[PDB]
Amino acid sequence: SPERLAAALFDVAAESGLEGASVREVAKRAGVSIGAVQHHFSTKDEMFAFALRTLVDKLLARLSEVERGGDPARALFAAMSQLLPLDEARSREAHVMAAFAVRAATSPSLAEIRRKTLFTIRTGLSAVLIGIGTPEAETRAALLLATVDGLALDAIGSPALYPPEYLEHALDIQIGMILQGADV
Amino acid sequence: TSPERLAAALFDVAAESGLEGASVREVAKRAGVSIGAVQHHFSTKDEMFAFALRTLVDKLLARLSEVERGGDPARALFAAMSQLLPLDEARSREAHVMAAFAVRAATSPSLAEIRRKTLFTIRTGLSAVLIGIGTPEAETRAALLLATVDGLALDAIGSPALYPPEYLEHALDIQIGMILQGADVVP
Numbered sequence: 001s002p003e004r005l006a007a008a009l010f011d012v013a014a015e016s017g018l019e020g021a022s023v024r025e026v027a028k029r030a031g032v033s034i035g036a037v038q039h040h041f042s043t044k045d046e047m048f049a050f051a052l053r054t055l056v057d058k059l060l061a062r063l064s065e066v067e068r069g070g071d072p073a074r075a076l077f078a079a080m081s082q083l084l085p086l087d088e089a090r091s092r093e094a095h096v097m098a099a100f101a102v103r104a105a106t107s108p109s110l111a112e113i114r115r116k117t118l119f120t121i122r123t124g125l126s127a128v129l130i131g132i133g134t135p136e137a138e139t140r141a142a143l144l145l146a147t148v149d150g151l152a153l154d155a156i157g158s159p160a161l162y163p164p165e166y167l168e169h170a171l172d173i174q175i176g177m178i179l180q181g182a183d184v
Numbered sequence: 185t186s187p188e189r190l191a192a193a194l195f196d197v198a199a200e201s202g203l204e205g206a207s208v209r210e211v212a213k214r215a216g217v218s219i220g221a222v223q224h225h226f227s228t229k230d231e232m233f234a235f236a237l238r239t240l241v242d243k244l245l246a247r248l249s250e251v252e253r254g255g256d257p258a259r260a261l262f263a264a265m266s267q268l269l270p271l272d273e274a275r276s277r278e279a280h281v282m283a284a285f286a287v288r289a290a291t292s293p294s295l296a297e298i299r300r301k302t303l304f305t306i307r308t309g310l311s312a313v314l315i316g317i318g319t320p321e322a323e324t325r326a327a328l329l330l331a332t333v334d335g336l337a338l339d340a341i342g343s344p345a346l347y348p349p350e351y352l353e354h355a356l357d358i359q360i361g362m363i364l365q366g367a368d369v370v371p
């Protein structure tokens with residue numbers, strides 16, 4: 001049931017933003033007793049945090065498939081492109097992730113989950129860049145991730161300015177910049 | 185003037201509780217006016233939100249246009265992009281509300297239009313600066329620079345204590361350095 005609720009929340013949020021994800025609306029979409037929800041989560045914020053944790057765990061599993069050695073540029077691109085709205089699935093994910101990032105302004109649990117998530121991805125990016133002798137690796141890693149997050153935010157609210165082919169070109173350009181001075 | 189007072193109340197509510205807290209009734213309550221007074225100016229909550237967003241983007245663009253460009257592009261780019269970073273309380277509030285509207289833009293055509301126009305305007309100015317100095321891939325690097333400030337602002341929302349102004353300014357300086365690599369400039 002809690003997994004079902006997390007999927008149902010993501011589904012509502014992608015459709016109608018997080019303002020649509022009332023305890024009531026999430027129940028309809030999964031099955032389930034409005035009490036069944038209350039059984040698993042004592043607060044709405046608990047329910048949101050669980051959904052975010054689910055989305056993050058799925059993202060990290062995806063990074064682990066695509067970021068598997070060999071050419072650094074291609075690995076960095078495959079990983080960062082998971083965060084960009086390049087198809088309908090990733091457009092929904094980007095929408096929901098951005099929504100959680102704004103909701104973190106008023107929710108310490110969501111802010112902490114995001115902080116740990118960014119720390120994890122950033123450390124992974126840093127390890128890649130250090131391994132190839134990149135100048136200012138850690139700072140550049142932070143910048144790569146921040147820039148990808150910003151591109152995703154910019155794109156969801158203005159898709160005509162950020163078609164997938166443009167997003168892919170912009171990510172290529174950013175990666176090329178980050179790798180300047182690396183070997184290779 | 186009256187719609188402007190309502191836009192200011194909306195911003196005050198949104199900076200506190202997000203845009204979820206910015207119902208017509210909550211905005212009316214914060215402004216000290218009747219629901220009827222609000223509905224008089226705004227036919228819909230959409231129109232209320234769009235007007236508030238326009239008010240905000242006007243303020244931001246006015247600040248960007250006040251940047252002294254002079255003869256040093258790195259300095260000008262830093263001064264301009266610093267205005268879009270949460271380096272103090274006022275800009276932290278602006279970041280929170282602007283990010284909220286960006287997210288709402290995913291489902292609201294009126295907000296998307298205002299966001300698109302804003303991004304187009306800013307990218308155009310940044311591209312002019314970069315082309316002016318022979319920056320490789322100037323247009324895309326302009327879009328990347330703007331994305332950097334947007335992404336850094338987004339993260340600083342949830343963890344403001346961890347993104348102090350000096351961290352944000354350092355990150356921005358490093359990105360500008362990368363953006364200017366291969367441009368006709370003299371460091």
Ligand SMILES: CCCCCCCCCCCCO[C@@H]1O[C@H](CO)[C@@H](O[C@H]2O[C@H](CO)[C@@H](O)[C@H](O)[C@H]2O)[C@H](O)[C@H]1O
Binds near residue numbers: 239245246298302310
């Ligand atoms: C220093 C180096 C880097 C420099 C970076 C430069 C950034 C450039 C910003 C300055 C330009 C501001 O110019 C401003 O553009 C916006 C469009 O976005 C216009 O605004 C127009 O669209 C908006 C948004 O839909 C409406 O709310 C507004 O009523 C309408 O007039 C303003 O009428 C114009 O005065």
Ligand SMILES: CC[N+](C)(C)CCCS(=O)(=O)[O-]
């Ligand atoms: C005609 C007067 N001006 C200020 C130009 C436009 C009025 C519409 S407004 O206030 O919503 O920009």
Ligand SMILES: CC[N+](C)(C)CCCS(=O)(=O)[O-]
Binds near residue numbers: 105108111342
């Ligand atoms: C409501 C408080 N928020 C912004 C969610 C968390 C603060 C995290 S902090 O202290 O590291 O900036």
